[PDB]
Amino acid sequence: GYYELYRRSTIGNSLVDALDTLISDGRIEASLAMRVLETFDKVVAETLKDNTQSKLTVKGNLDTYGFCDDVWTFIVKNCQVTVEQSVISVDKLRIVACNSKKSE
Amino acid sequence: LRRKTRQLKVL
Amino acid sequence: SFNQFVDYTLQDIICEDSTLILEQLAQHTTESDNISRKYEISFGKIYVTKPMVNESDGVTHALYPQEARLRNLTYSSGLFVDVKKRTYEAIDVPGRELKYELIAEESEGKVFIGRLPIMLRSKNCYLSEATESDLYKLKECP
Amino acid sequence: FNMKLAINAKTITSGLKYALATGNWGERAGVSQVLNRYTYSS
Amino acid sequence: ALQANQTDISKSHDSSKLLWATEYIQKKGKPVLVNELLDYLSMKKDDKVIELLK
Amino acid sequence: NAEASRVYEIIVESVVNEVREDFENAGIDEQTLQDLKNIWQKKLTETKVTTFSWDYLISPDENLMLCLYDKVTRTKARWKCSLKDGVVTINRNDYTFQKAQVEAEWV
Amino acid sequence: TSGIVPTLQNIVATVTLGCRLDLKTVALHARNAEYNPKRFAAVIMRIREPKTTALIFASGKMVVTGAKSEDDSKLASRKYARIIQKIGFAAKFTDFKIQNIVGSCDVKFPIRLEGLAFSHGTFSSYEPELFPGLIYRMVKPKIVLLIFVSGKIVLTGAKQREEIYQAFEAIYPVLSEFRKM
Amino acid sequence: LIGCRRAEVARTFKEIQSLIHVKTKEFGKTLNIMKNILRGKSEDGFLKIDTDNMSGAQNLTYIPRFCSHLGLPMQVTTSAEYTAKKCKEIKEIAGKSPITIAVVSIYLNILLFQIPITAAKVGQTLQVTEGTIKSGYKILYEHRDKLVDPQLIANGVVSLDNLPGV
């Protein structure tokens, strides 16, 4: 198994908001829903690292950090991000990260 | 139980 | 006799037992560690220094026979050998014959093996190339 | 593994020095003697 | 959260359940009867637990 | 961002190409696939993020990002974070990256 | 006498909270928490306004470092205990003991550390190849001093002000006789 | 290490670590403990005057060995000993390690005597960072008059204009 994060993203919330309608309509069962979420996370973690080419950096002040369950949570405030340049100001940003070690 | 290291006479 | 010994017999003695091979078997309880290692230390060319002496504090300087006689030192010179370090690994599959390959850790590199006492007026001694006036400067009898 | 501990140079050095200082050729006696410096012909 | 962190005591096998039962009867200084033990674990109906413990 | 557009395109294509065999194993009809693709497409368009072609206690429309850290270190005030393989959601805008250096100052 | 008083830079204290804690729950619910059970057997929590760092242990022990004064260490320990109570553990502030008090100061003259080691060799160890400072271990009071060539003195191992202050006042006469230029 | 220091044949921690694969921290701890034990034994039994034998720096004893390793002449070795002795008067560099002090004095005298050995070669021989040697030379460049042995320039074997500037 792999890490379980990407339902909180834009594709993930639309994913669960589409799968719950199929749960209500009976178009998918619970085991099939769990394994399709697991294989979605697997394929996202597989193809998010090979055929993409963008850069992004952030500089700011962290208001909160946290480390338990081998995840890192950050709440940085008044931070500027640079893409590829293109600079975007951020009032508040939350960062959730996992380790490089394979789970299970 | 097996001997870990051994000497080889070069030939 | 000493010139023949230093020129050829030292190298012959090194080259008869130049290589030394030690095999570390896998000793594998599980098949995840089925590798056998083969560490070879190989001697090569031997070099002889000019006659020298190292003092207490690590200072190494050229030693002359008059100084050795006065200070009760051994009129000797250092012997160095080339040592090259082969290492091999093989997949320790039972039944199948082991085939070893280098991991390219072939380090090689003169290292000190001891001091050979030098007979005077031989090809290694300082007094062989010295003229009569040079012998008088070195306080050696012509 | 340290090669300076792998090679004991004192083995060769002390062996040659001992066998040339005392005439015991080993580890035949009187192989090496103190050079006679009584006369040039001696 | 720490009362909720303990999972269901209905494991997939019977040896863990009898382990919990003998742990409870060891930690209790007096002999206990059937219904309090069945209240201690998560099911009440008669199953393999009572016959194996007998 | 065209990069984020094609990233989400290969996400939806590879996910449905993996879902097809699972749906064949489950036994449901092929009608359950293209309507699923269309509702994914309509919600990703209606989110309006990326274009397409089809006192000390921890307690959508939020600038937030999901990632995977490589190496996090800390000095007297400075926080260095080497992060990798993430998705980024600032200002209703999604971004991706390979590496990310995060510099923070802790008061 | 001495014209300069040392300033404390770090105070380490221990507090027993009197109950067992769940480091998992306090790490998920505390703000600035560091729980890595395979790296250290404690959760590491730091706050801003006294600039301290606590190591909360599962046995209810708490080690608070980073404080500049004993009152700051007391206030920080009370704030951490209040944090634990707001997380929801019955952590009574039972006792508070300060173990390590370290302070830095400047005598503002160069010091002959080799001569100091030669003179007070029975108290001082000087290994400039390892560390560029002289370690002087006073027997009364038991204070370890780090002497540097720039005049910087680091006094550690104190339990209150009434070891570090007279440790500096006793090391000053034996440092005034070792000056350069 | 204690035997070398007591025989005034003192080597450095890098030398003893090149011989024995020992961690630096507990090597220093063991050395401190054994020095305390030896001082206690001296106080209990026969008393010995240290007269600068257990001193941590001992930078004058490292100059001839390092000069021998670099193949330097005897006058260059003596001038390096004089420079290392005069570096103790300099406040800013007296806090440095004795190995670094000896190496930068030796390199300064090498540049003074036009010995064709580069700072990289000195660093490779004596296991000192080339940047550290260069920084030590650039900071001892200011104190050229005190460090360089006066009768050397009186006899004209060396001159202070030979040292490259910063």
Any idea where the domains of chain F sit in the sequence?
A: 1-54, 55-107
Tokens (6 digits) for G118: 């030669």
Longest dimension (CA), chain D: 54
* Secondary structure (3-state) at H60: helix
Reported resolution, Å: 3.0
Indicate the CATH number of F1-54 among 1.10.287.100, 3.40.50.1220, 3.90.1150.10, 3.30.460.80.
Answer: 1.10.287.100
Q: At what angle do helices H59-70 and H119-126 cross, to 10 degrees?
A: 110
Q: Which range marks the domain in which residue C32 is found? A: 1-142
Pairing of strands C19-24, F93-105: unpaired
Q: What is the spatial distance between Cα C15 and Cα C94, in angstroms, rounded to a whole number?
A: 34
Q: Domain locations in chain A?
A: 1-53, 54-100
Taken in order of first residue, the domains within chain G and their CATH numbers are 2-12+99-181 (3.30.310.10), 13-98 (3.30.310.10)
DSSP string, H71-117: T--HHHHHHHHHHHHHTTT-HHHHTS-HHHHHHHHHHHHHHHTT---
User: How do beta strands F64-74 and A86-98 pair?
Assistant: parallel
Distance, in Å, from the CA atom of E34 to the CA atom of E25, rounded to the nearest integer, reads 11
Residues in G touching E2 (Cβ below 8 Å): 22, 25
| F36: its two tokens | 């699923």
- State which H helix or E strand residue G124 sits in: strand G124-126
How many angstroms away from the CA of H157 is the closest CA of chain G? Answer: 31
Helix A10-25 crosses helix A30-47 at what angle (to 10 degrees)?
160
Of the candidates G128, G112, G110, the one whose C-alpha atom is nearest the C-alpha of residue G120 is G112
Q: How many angstroms separate the CA atoms of C90 and G152, rounded?
A: 59
Determine the Cα–Cα distance for residues C106 and C88; give it in Å rounded to an integer. Answer: 10
Hey, which residues 17-36 in chain D have their CB within 8 Å of chain C?
17, 20
G108 Rama class: left (phi>0) / alpha (psi -120 to 50) / beta: left
Closest to H35 (Cβ–Cβ): which among G125, G128, G181?
G125
Consecutive H or E run containing C41:
strand C35-54
Common-topology check for domains A1-53 and A54-100: no
Nearest Cα residue to F95 out of D37, G167, A82: A82
Q: Which residue has the tokens 């097996």?
A: B2
Please tell me the distance from the alpha carbon of residue H6 to that of residue H49, in angstroms, as a whole number. 11
| CATH architecture observed for domain F55-107 | Roll (2.30)
Region of residue G66 (left: phi > 0; alpha: psi -120 to 50; beta: else)? left
G41-80 b/e with 16+ CB inside 10 Å = b?
A: ebbbbbbeebebbbbbbeebebbbbbbbebebbbebbebb
Contacts with G43 from chain A: Cβ below 8 Å = 68
Q: Is H75 within 8 Å of H157 (Cβ atoms)?
A: yes
Look-up of token digits 């990326």: F50
- Residue E48's alpha-carbon distances to E20, E33, E43, E44, in angstroms, are 14, 17, 12, 12
Output helix, strand, coil percentages for chain G, rounded to the nearest 5: 25, 30, 40
Nearest-CA distance F71 → chain G (Å): 14
Integer Cα distance of G39 and G61 in angstroms: 18
C84 token code pair: 């090259």
Query: Which residue has tokens 């001997």?
Result: B3
Q: From CA H28, how far away is CA H11, in angstroms rounded? A: 14
A56-68/F93-105 β-pairing: parallel
**Quick one: closest CA in C to D10, which residue?**
C114
Kindly list the distances between the CA atom of residue F88 and the CA atoms of A43, A97, F46, F92, F98, in Å, as whole numbers in the listed order: 18, 12, 18, 10, 12
The number of residues making up chain H comes to: 166
Q: Which two tokens stand for residue C31?
A: 């098949």
The CATH T-level fold of domain A54-100 is TATA box binding Protein, subunit D; domain 2 (2.30.18)
Among the listed residues F91, F19, F85, the one whose alpha carbon sits nearest the alpha carbon of residue A10: F91
Q: Do C22 and B7 touch (CB under 8 A)?
A: yes
Name A61's bridge partners. A77
Rounded to 10°, the helix H74-86/H98-112 angle is 130
D17 chain-C contacts, CB cut-off 8 A: 74, 76, 115, 117
Q: Which residues contact G60 (CB under 8 A, 6 or more apart)?
A: G16, G17, G18, G19, G20, G21, G91
Report how many Cβ contacts below 8 Å link chain A to chain G.
22
What tokens appear for H25 in the block? Answer: 């921290």
Mark yes or no for CB contact G86/F55 under 8 Å.
yes
Radius of gyration of chain G (CA): 20
CB contact under 8 A, F63 and A92: yes
> H or E stretch including E50?
helix E48-53
Locate F78 and state its tokens.
């400075």
Q: Which residues pair with A76 in a beta bridge?
A: A62, A93
Q: Within 10 Å of residue A57's Cβ, how many Cβ atoms?
A: 17
Q: Which of F96, F104, F100, F102 is nearest to F84 (CA)?
A: F100
- Give just the sign of the alpha carbon dihedral A8, A14, A15, A16: positive
How is residue H115 written in tokens? 């010995």
Contact check, Cβ <8 Å, G122/H39: yes
Cα distance from G158 to chain H (closest Cα, Å)?
22
Q: Amino acid identity of A24?
A: S
List the single residue in C with minimal CA-CA distance to B8. C21
Contact residues on chain G for H91, CB-CB shorter than 8 A: 110, 149, 180-181
Give the chain C residue whose CA is nearest to the CA of D19: C117
Superfamily the domain A1-53 falls into: Transcription factor IIA gamma subunit, alpha-helical domain (1.10.287.190)
Residue given tokens 């009071």 in the structure block: G141
**Rounded to 5°, angle at Cα A99 from A93 and A102:** 140
Method of structure determination? cryo-EM
- Cβ B6–C22 below 8 Å, yes or no? yes
In DSSP terms, G43 is beta-bridged to G35, G56
- Residue A46, φ and ψ in degrees, nearest 5: -80, -50
In the structure encoding, which two tokens stand for residue A27, read together? 């178009």
Neighbours of chain H (3+ CB pairs under 8 A): C, D, G
How many domains does one find in chain C? 1
Listed by number, the residues of chain F in 50-79 with a beta carbon closer than 8 Å to a beta carbon of chain A are 50, 58, 60, 62-70, 72, 79
Which residues are A87's β-sheet partners? A82
The verdict on a CB contact (< 8 Å) between F57 and G87 is: yes
